[PDB]
Design an enzyme around this catalytic site. Structure first.
Site, PDB file in Angstrom:
ATOM      1  N   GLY A 150       0.814  -1.197   0.000  1.00  0.00           N
ATOM      2  CA  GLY A 150       0.000   0.000   0.000  1.00  0.00           C
ATOM      3  C   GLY A 150       0.849   1.248   0.000  1.00  0.00           C
ATOM      4  O   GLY A 150       1.961   1.288  -0.546  1.00  0.00           O
ATOM      5  N   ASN A 162       2.944   5.307   6.049  1.00  0.00           N
ATOM      6  CA  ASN A 162       3.928   5.004   7.085  1.00  0.00           C
ATOM      7  C   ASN A 162       4.419   3.551   7.108  1.00  0.00           C
ATOM      8  O   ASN A 162       5.620   3.276   7.011  1.00  0.00           O
ATOM      9  CB  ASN A 162       3.282   5.370   8.435  1.00  0.00           C
ATOM     10  CG  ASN A 162       4.240   5.272   9.606  1.00  0.00           C
ATOM     11  OD1 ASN A 162       5.425   5.566   9.485  1.00  0.00           O
ATOM     12  ND2 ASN A 162       3.717   4.867  10.762  1.00  0.00           N
ATOM     13  N   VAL A 163       3.485   2.620   7.254  1.00  0.00           N
ATOM     14  CA  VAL A 163       3.850   1.216   7.418  1.00  0.00           C
ATOM     15  C   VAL A 163       4.408   0.624   6.129  1.00  0.00           C
ATOM     16  O   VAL A 163       5.428  -0.058   6.139  1.00  0.00           O
ATOM     17  CB  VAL A 163       2.668   0.377   7.936  1.00  0.00           C
ATOM     18  CG1 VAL A 163       3.036  -1.105   7.951  1.00  0.00           C
ATOM     19  CG2 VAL A 163       2.274   0.852   9.325  1.00  0.00           C
ATOM     20  N   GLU A 199      -0.974  -2.217  -7.139  1.00  0.00           N
ATOM     21  CA  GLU A 199      -1.776  -1.130  -7.710  1.00  0.00           C
ATOM     22  C   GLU A 199      -0.943   0.106  -7.978  1.00  0.00           C
ATOM     23  O   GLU A 199      -1.230   0.877  -8.903  1.00  0.00           O
ATOM     24  CB  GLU A 199      -2.858  -0.696  -6.726  1.00  0.00           C
ATOM     25  CG  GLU A 199      -3.902  -1.711  -6.454  1.00  0.00           C
ATOM     26  CD  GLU A 199      -5.006  -1.147  -5.584  1.00  0.00           C
ATOM     27  OE1 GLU A 199      -4.785  -0.120  -4.907  1.00  0.00           O
ATOM     28  OE2 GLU A 199      -6.112  -1.706  -5.605  1.00  0.00           O
ATOM     29  N   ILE A 241      -8.599  -0.839   9.311  1.00  0.00           N
ATOM     30  CA  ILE A 241      -9.122  -0.100  10.450  1.00  0.00           C
ATOM     31  C   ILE A 241      -9.002  -0.966  11.708  1.00  0.00           C
ATOM     32  O   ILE A 241      -8.388  -0.568  12.697  1.00  0.00           O
ATOM     33  CB  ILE A 241     -10.599   0.296  10.217  1.00  0.00           C
ATOM     34  CG1 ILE A 241     -10.718   1.202   8.995  1.00  0.00           C
ATOM     35  CG2 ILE A 241     -11.187   0.984  11.452  1.00  0.00           C
ATOM     36  CD1 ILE A 241     -10.065   2.542   9.166  1.00  0.00           C
ATOM     37  N   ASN A 247     -11.889   5.603   3.436  1.00  0.00           N
ATOM     38  CA  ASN A 247     -11.567   5.725   2.015  1.00  0.00           C
ATOM     39  C   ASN A 247     -12.422   4.835   1.122  1.00  0.00           C
ATOM     40  O   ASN A 247     -13.168   5.326   0.279  1.00  0.00           O
ATOM     41  CB  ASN A 247     -10.075   5.471   1.765  1.00  0.00           C
ATOM     42  CG  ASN A 247      -9.196   6.384   2.604  1.00  0.00           C
ATOM     43  OD1 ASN A 247      -9.453   7.591   2.694  1.00  0.00           O
ATOM     44  ND2 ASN A 247      -8.177   5.812   3.244  1.00  0.00           N
ATOM     45  N   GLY A 294      -8.589  -1.979  -3.782  1.00  0.00           N
ATOM     46  CA  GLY A 294      -8.189  -3.265  -4.333  1.00  0.00           C
ATOM     47  C   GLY A 294      -7.795  -4.275  -3.266  1.00  0.00           C
ATOM     48  O   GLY A 294      -7.207  -5.316  -3.577  1.00  0.00           O
ATOM     49  N   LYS A 321      -6.145   6.495  17.449  1.00  0.00           N
ATOM     50  CA  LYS A 321      -6.596   7.675  18.179  1.00  0.00           C
ATOM     51  C   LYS A 321      -5.858   7.831  19.507  1.00  0.00           C
ATOM     52  O   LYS A 321      -6.470   7.979  20.563  1.00  0.00           O
ATOM     53  CB  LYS A 321      -8.114   7.633  18.389  1.00  0.00           C
ATOM     54  CG  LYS A 321      -8.913   7.661  17.087  1.00  0.00           C
ATOM     55  CD  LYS A 321      -8.509   8.856  16.232  1.00  0.00           C
ATOM     56  CE  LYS A 321      -9.139   8.812  14.848  1.00  0.00           C
ATOM     57  NZ  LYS A 321     -10.610   9.030  14.880  1.00  0.00           N
TER      58      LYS A 321
HETATM   59  C1  LIG Z   1      -7.471   1.087   6.489  1.00  0.00           C
HETATM   60  C2  LIG Z   1      -6.683   2.355   6.089  1.00  0.00           C
HETATM   61  C3  LIG Z   1      -7.551   3.589   6.198  1.00  0.00           C
HETATM   62  C4  LIG Z   1      -5.451   2.552   7.016  1.00  0.00           C
HETATM   63  O1  LIG Z   1      -4.682   3.653   6.725  1.00  0.00           O
HETATM   64  P1  LIG Z   1      -3.162   3.651   7.141  1.00  0.00           P
HETATM   65  O2  LIG Z   1      -2.435   4.769   6.421  1.00  0.00           O
HETATM   66  O3  LIG Z   1      -2.531   2.335   6.799  1.00  0.00           O
HETATM   67  O4  LIG Z   1      -3.023   3.780   8.706  1.00  0.00           O
HETATM   68  P2  LIG Z   1      -3.493   4.967   9.654  1.00  0.00           P
HETATM   69  O5  LIG Z   1      -3.122   4.463  11.035  1.00  0.00           O
HETATM   70  O6  LIG Z   1      -2.729   6.239   9.352  1.00  0.00           O
HETATM   71  O7  LIG Z   1      -5.063   5.235   9.609  1.00  0.00           O
HETATM   72  C5  LIG Z   1      -5.696   6.122   8.683  1.00  0.00           C
HETATM   73  C6  LIG Z   1      -6.891   6.810   9.190  1.00  0.00           C
HETATM   74  O8  LIG Z   1      -7.836   5.863   9.656  1.00  0.00           O
HETATM   75  C7  LIG Z   1      -7.999   6.048  11.024  1.00  0.00           C
HETATM   76  N1  LIG Z   1      -8.086   4.799  11.713  1.00  0.00           N
HETATM   77  C8  LIG Z   1      -7.264   3.759  11.562  1.00  0.00           C
HETATM   78  N2  LIG Z   1      -7.671   2.774  12.379  1.00  0.00           N
HETATM   79  C9  LIG Z   1      -8.765   3.194  13.050  1.00  0.00           C
HETATM   80  C10 LIG Z   1      -9.594   2.617  14.010  1.00  0.00           C
HETATM   81  N3  LIG Z   1      -9.321   1.284  14.484  1.00  0.00           N
HETATM   82  N4  LIG Z   1     -10.631   3.316  14.508  1.00  0.00           N
HETATM   83  C11 LIG Z   1     -10.857   4.558  14.075  1.00  0.00           C
HETATM   84  N5  LIG Z   1     -10.075   5.142  13.155  1.00  0.00           N
HETATM   85  C12 LIG Z   1      -9.027   4.491  12.627  1.00  0.00           C
HETATM   86  C13 LIG Z   1      -6.780   6.791  11.463  1.00  0.00           C
HETATM   87  O9  LIG Z   1      -7.082   7.548  12.583  1.00  0.00           O
HETATM   88  C14 LIG Z   1      -6.515   7.619  10.350  1.00  0.00           C
HETATM   89  O10 LIG Z   1      -7.436   8.694  10.380  1.00  0.00           O
HETATM   90  P3  LIG Z   1      -6.995  10.228  10.122  1.00  0.00           P
HETATM   91  O11 LIG Z   1      -6.387  10.380   8.750  1.00  0.00           O
HETATM   92  O12 LIG Z   1      -8.258  11.069  10.211  1.00  0.00           O
HETATM   93  O13 LIG Z   1      -5.978  10.671  11.159  1.00  0.00           O
HETATM   94  C15 LIG Z   1      -6.155   2.234   4.664  1.00  0.00           C
HETATM   95  O14 LIG Z   1      -5.273   1.142   4.560  1.00  0.00           O
HETATM   96  C16 LIG Z   1      -7.226   2.050   3.603  1.00  0.00           C
HETATM   97  O15 LIG Z   1      -7.987   2.983   3.303  1.00  0.00           O
HETATM   98  N6  LIG Z   1      -7.443   0.716   3.089  1.00  0.00           N
HETATM   99  C17 LIG Z   1      -8.398   0.484   2.018  1.00  0.00           C
HETATM  100  C18 LIG Z   1      -7.828   0.484   0.611  1.00  0.00           C
HETATM  101  C19 LIG Z   1      -6.742  -0.560   0.394  1.00  0.00           C
HETATM  102  O16 LIG Z   1      -6.313  -1.225   1.317  1.00  0.00           O
HETATM  103  N7  LIG Z   1      -6.275  -0.813  -0.946  1.00  0.00           N
HETATM  104  C20 LIG Z   1      -5.256  -1.855  -1.188  1.00  0.00           C
HETATM  105  C21 LIG Z   1      -3.974  -1.416  -1.878  1.00  0.00           C
HETATM  106  S1  LIG Z   1      -3.183   0.033  -1.191  1.00  0.00           S
END
Ligand SMILES: CC(C)(COP(=O)(O)OP(=O)(O)OC[C@H]1O[C@@H](n2cnc3c(N)ncnc32)[C@H](O)[C@@H]1OP(=O)(O)O)[C@@H](O)C(=O)NCCC(=O)NCCS
Ligand SMILES: CC(C)(COP(=O)(O)OP(=O)(O)OC[C@H]1O[C@@H](n2cnc3c(N)ncnc32)[C@H](O)[C@@H]1OP(=O)(O)O)[C@@H](O)C(=O)NCCC(=O)NCCS
Ligand SMILES: [Cl-]
Ligand SMILES: [Cl-]
Ligand SMILES: [Cl-]
Ligand SMILES: [Cl-]
Lengths: 504, 513
Positions: free
Chosen positions: B268, B271-272, B293, B363, B383, B387, B407
């Site tokens: 993806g 950060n991670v 992707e 999440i 979001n 994929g 949070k």
């Molecule tokens: C799930 C997803 C949102 C995580 O994002 P991430 O960059 O890996 O990790 P983050 O810890 O920064 O979390 C992103 C946001 O979701 C929120 N979030 C993450 N886990 C949460 C939880 N358990 N409860 C509430 N909010 C949460 C974070 O607070 C952050 O919100 P913010 O931007 O308002 O501060 C992201 O991976 C995604 O949208 N996945 C769907 C699409 C996908 O996986 N496509 C595949 C190829 S990339």
């Protein structure tokens, strides 16, 4: 007619009891068996007896049991009775085994059926110590002719350290020729081969499973029966569902969104499936083709009446009447049926390519059209996901079919939130109950809810569902998929508490 | 030099504002754009202005907006600010658009990315009135060279009644040749063609999108930047997650369950992912391949070092610094990268055949390893599924990675029950947090719970999870996947009510005793 046609292999014939002694505590055992067809029978019984004796003496004696899909009393049943299975995958329908699973006495994981072979090769279940496979015959060149299913048998034979064959004289010798076993890399180490199937009626392999004869530790001559499906007929609820679906197919064809012959059909087994297939047997769509997991009574009738030209599957699920029927005209039916490895019948690449129409049952759906296929109240296993995910996600159209209620009206099959999810919204486009049909294509979750509630829910529950949704829209954390978390699972808890989802 | 090399088509050049007038209230509009790259910019801005002006006079003006995936401020942002979108699909990351979706002002459905083209051809979104596609150039024979992504553009061009092209001189001319566009039947009417990709570096098509020039109603000359999000430098949590994953890869290799070159990798952004890519650059591996992707900063880094031999994707997702790096060396990087239609990058048949390793965020997961990728508290979109389903289910190994809390510690990312499910247990084998890694292969749900709770859950939440599980084991309707329906969603409700999932000691809680 001698069933073991390879002379040299006849020297390996031995009693079921002696063969069972090859299987040790801790062993991983891969067997034939799919939709109650083609599973080993006599060795499992002998094993179960010895397990009970061992337990009584204070000796541990359990196996891991990996199959094609469901088996029968002789295998899942006897082994469950003996408390002899520590882990089970991927799909069970036996009541004794189901009880073991729901008591936490046998560990169970219901993998997507088309993925099991690949996960087995990857080692997810561990090293296969034993393959125990039922055969119709053994050819002069040492080929193993499958019985009433193919399932995962070729993979288990590949993986297993020792092989035990049950040659079952009950099985029709004329099954020989019906199977199509591909020698290519479908579920092995990447990169895999392309499977050159571009039509549902296309054979790409041979009639036998292949195994190194040096790996065969025992052959057991057996004589015992597969399970049969119920004869029972579609009730008023099932016929109403079929009616709505067939009207839908008619309208799609009229709008040029389906060919007059529809597309390759995937169907389940059960009241609803039979009704749908019964509907098609006398329907306006000709030259149908099946690309499915199973050959059931409904499909058999159409191959008979020419309304369906050919059917691909991995197994049979027939009533005694239907079994008798096919066993009388095997030479005919054998030309209209192709039985494939389950990792081919259930290959998402192939299913999408052919544009399959998927029609599956369900425990329940929530108002947003998430589907539970498996876990009643979220925790109690029924059968398993089986191939419903393989098909739902890969299909051209994904359709789910169910009575709008269960347990004599004491459960609503449409709920505020599904207690367990097997199929996400994205994997379900069409819902059908005896109340009507909901077409969810292109709709947001709140739009899905309007269709599902108004078209599919039972009148007894519709106002309650609407009330939940309306208050959710007002009070939910977010409004994209409105919920009231304090109430979302409350109908399920109401059923646990009172025996009904209807308020007092 | 001249970007429009077909002379006849130059007659269709016009201002952005004029082009925007071709788009009418109610229209379904398909655009280029994926991970903030290659989306149209000037026409949407002009459209938004005209929409706002209409609304101010009590005149309705909204569209249905179908994209490749996420776009940027000039498109999702401007249109959302104008309240100009009645329906949106399949994936958005703009904050204003997110707000419209969560308020119910924009209807939204996040289809699996690799399926979008097929569903569009099936007619699920209705008839496409407009295709609005950004281009690097137009070739002598009228071919449309895409920009920093391919997405669904070829499909949108096929379906749309009228076509508008934005030729963006900000986009490097040497992008021409980097794309692979197939004329094969990937997402059309069954029976579809076999998509014959058997290696990640394989080209099956050509460099241009194809469109009947008679459908081109307007071409707009532009000069504007993509949304190049700032580099998210790994924090200690990310580094810990990456460390556990890399240790796991190392072990799989030592056990011959993966080759030293691993398998084609899907990752993806953020950060991670950045931490993992940095770890891969330094690790005991070689000859890596990407089949994903997106191309991200860390991928360019390995393509340069030679650690990665090729990277396949549908789009770029680069920081400004990385964007600069690739622009000054596009000649080099164009030879190491293949940009494909998203219905090919995300094709389940191809992903499985190649045996991709999928690495995705989440999440939350519940104790049984069902995954929520989208809906906070079950109801508020982040979001979209994107994929993640295409890859998770089709992969050789499906891995989910996340901080164990969110949070600032007030939410646990491991919960009794997920408030929404995107990926069922069957679609997730490995979980990783900064607490450790759970390997779930071959396990039942109760066994999954033992591993997830012990390996992945935060120490602040583990006792509460164990308590829920223990009491569920004693009381649940069935014991195959034990739950207490009375409290399954109670931690989420607790957060809603109090802003934290951590319980007060002013009331009784079973784990306190
Ligand atoms: C799930 C997803 C949102 C995580 O994002 P991430 O960059 O890996 O990790 P983050 O810890 O920064 O979390 C992103 C946001 O979701 C929120 N979030 C993450 N886990 C949460 C939880 N358990 N409860 C509430 N909010 C949460 C974070 O607070 C952050 O919100 P913010 O931007 O308002 O501060 C992201 O991976 C995604 O949208 N996945 C769907 C699409 C996908 O996986 N496509 C595949 C190829 S990339
Ligand atoms: C979901 C499934 C159990 C339904 O089977 P069905 O025969 O079509 O539907 P039925 O109305 O006859 O109900 C079957 C059983 O499930 C129970 N059931 C169905 N819905 C229920 C609900 N909402 N709550 C509780 N129990 C329910 C019924 O009571 C019945 O059980 P019983 O005989 O002990 O009373 C079945 O389709 C299945 O197991 N699906 C998983 C595998 C699959 O779909 N594979 C794909 C095709 S091969
Ligand atoms: Cl294939
Ligand atoms: Cl859709
Ligand atoms: Cl293919
Ligand atoms: Cl597994």
């Amino acid at each position: 007619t001698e069933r073991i046609r390879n002379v040299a292999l006849r020297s390996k014939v031995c009693p079921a009891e002696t063969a069972s002694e090859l299987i040790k505590h801790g062993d991983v055992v891969g067997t034939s068996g799919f939709t109650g067809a083609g599973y080993p029978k006599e060795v499992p019984k002998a094993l179960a007896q010895r397990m009970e004796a061992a337990h009584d003496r204070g000796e541990k004696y359990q196996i891991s049991l990996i199959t094609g899909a469901s088996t029968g009393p002789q295998l899942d049943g006897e082994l469950a009775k003996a408390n002899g299975v520590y882990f089970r995958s991927p799909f069970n329908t036996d009541a004794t085994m189901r009880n073991r699973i729901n008591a936490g006495e046998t560990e169970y994981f219901d993998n997507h059926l088309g993925q099991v072979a690949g996960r087995a090769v990857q080692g997810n279940y561990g090293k296969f110590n034993i393959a125990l496979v039922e055969a119709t015959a053994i050819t002069e060149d040492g080929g193993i002719v499958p019985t009433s299913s193919v399932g995962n048998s070729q993979t288990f034979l590949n993986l297993a350290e020792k092989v035990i064959i049950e040659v079952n004289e009950w099985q029709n010798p004329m099954l020989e020729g019906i199977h199509d076993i591909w020698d290519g890399n479908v579920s092995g180490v990447p990169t895999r081969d392309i499977v050159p199937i571009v039509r549902a009626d296309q054979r790409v392999g041979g009639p036998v499973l292949r195994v190194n004869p040096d790996k065969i530790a025992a052959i057991v001559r057996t004589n015992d029966r597969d399970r049969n499906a119920p004869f029972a007929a579609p009730d008023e609820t099932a016929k109403a569902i079929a009616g709505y679906l067939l009207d839908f197919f008619g309208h799609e064809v009229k709008q040029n969104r389906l060919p007059p012959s529809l597309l390759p059909l995937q169907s389940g087994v059960g009241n609803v499936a039979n009704a749908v297939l019964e509907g098609l047997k006398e329907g306006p769509f000709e030259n149908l083709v099946g690309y499915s997991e199973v050959i059931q009574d409904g499909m058999l009738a159409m191959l008979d009446s020419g309304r369906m030209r050919i059917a691909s599957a991995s197994s049979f699920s027939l009533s005694p009447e239907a079994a008798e029927e096919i066993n009388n005209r095997m030479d005919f039916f054998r030309s209209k049926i192709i039985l494939r490895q389950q990792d081919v019948s259930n290959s998402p690449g192939i299913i999408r390519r052919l544009g399959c129409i998927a029609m599956n049952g369900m425990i329940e759906a929530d108002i947003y059209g998430n589907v539970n296929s498996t876990r009643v109240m979220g925790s109690k296993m029924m059968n398993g996901i089986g191939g419903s995910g393989d098909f739902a996600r890969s299909s051209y159209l994904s359709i789910f079919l169910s009575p709008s209620t269960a347990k004599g009206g004491k459960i609503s099959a449409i709920v505020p939130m599904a207690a367990h999810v097997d199929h996400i919204m994205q994997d379900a486009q069409i819902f059908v109950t005896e109340q009507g049909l909901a077409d969810l294509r292109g709709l947001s979750p709140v739009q899905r809810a309007r269709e599902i509630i108004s078209k599919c829910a039972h009148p007894d529950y519709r106002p309650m569902l609407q009330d939940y949704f309306d208050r959710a829209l007002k009070n939910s954390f977010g409004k994209h998929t409105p919920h009231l978390l304090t109430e979302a699972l409350s109908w399920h808890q109401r059923f646990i508490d009172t025996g009904t989802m209807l308020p007092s």
